[model samples]
Target chain A: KVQIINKKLDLSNVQSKCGSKDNIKHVPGGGSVQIVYKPVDLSKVTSKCGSLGNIHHKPGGGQVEVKSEKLDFKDRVQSKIGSLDNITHVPGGGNKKIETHKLTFRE
Target chain B: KVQIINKKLDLSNVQSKCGSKDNIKHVPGGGSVQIVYKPVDLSKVTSKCGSLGNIHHKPGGGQVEVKSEKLDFKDRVQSKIGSLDNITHVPGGGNKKIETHKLTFRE
Candidate 1:
């Protein structure tokens, strides 16, 4: 005959470990999650084009110059010196400006 | 008897019709080609995030606030309120700014 004595279950080793630990995300106590971004100022941004030419081909590579408040671009602006494809720094290479801004973490 | 006559050869009509005239480009006198871009003011270029939340979760949606002069962004800025993938008005989401400026015709 065997007599059993009741003892605190040592369930620490029996804890179920099924879910993946790699993908787990924790929300800290009294904390929150959020996204933030800062849009660019269309005025301070400047860039250089390939050595094709300037708007007037001023002996150096062409550059994107914002002369005034208006930002002008055409889907099919005409050019005779270099291919519009040669231009650089401009996003999308044509009348397309930076439209969609990507979301980033802030904390 | 083919009457050989020098009538300016009628070359106007027979101008070696070969190359596609559609692809022909003409550079006018005293003219040049260049690329131009007007970068955003960064400060004035304000945008609203989706109605998810803000950096501080203000009453309205998140706004790209340029309180100072310098621009700050990260490929993965940390957040605690919402997913980093929710922010808007950013150029390339994670640590990316508008790098390229496209070329356009001026005249």
Candidate 2:
């Protein structure tokens, strides 16, 4: 996940290290940052996880449905991840196992 | 209102001009900027405005409640102004006349 240390966002946890150097830029100073996991695309994977409706896949990729135990937490996650543009894919499974993947930023 | 051109936010209309110099900062290069009027503190002024309950004032001042014509518009305004900090006050009374006053930024 992304963390703001000082003037820059600490993207170290978002990826393993570097691949041709991540395209980093200066974020406007001030305002808090929330690092929320983006929705997963189940189509790219080959897994027999969850129920028939939950484990969706297609020729290329498909949607994987997951859920939060509580409503407040679910709303909070949706509020943060809804309008976000920059999404990074990290290792992990469903909502409970969302691992740090990519570091998408406003570019 | 604040209009952003290039890298800088145009604070020309936020205020008449400079007092000692407006506190401006470099917003991160990416991300779009939305200019919304902040809520007003009616305690600082004197007016015989609106209804008995709507137009409130006291030794200092009080609340001046207003409304948006439609639910969608009202929701939109609330969504924009809800969590925003660094508010800038403009002239004009009520929701209809929220004139551009100050230019608040992330700083």
Candidate that would win on TM-score: 2
Chain A TM-score of each candidate structure, as shown: 0.13, 0.13
Residue A57 alpha-carbon offset, candidate 2, angstroms = 60
lDDT of each: 0.24, 0.24
Stretches of candidate 2 off by over 4 Å are A1-107, B1-20, B23-107
**Each model's number of backbone clashes?**
31, 13
Cα error, residue B5 of model 1, in Å, equals 39
* Candidate 2: tens digits of C-alpha lDDT, residues B5-99: 22233211122211222222222312212121222111112223222223212122222223223211111111211222233333333223223
Q: What is the DockQ of candidate 2?
A: 0.02
Candidate 2 chain A minimal-lDDT segment of 10 residues = A72-81
Over B61-90, each residue of candidate 1 has an lDDT whose tens digit, in order, gives: 222321223322222222233222221322
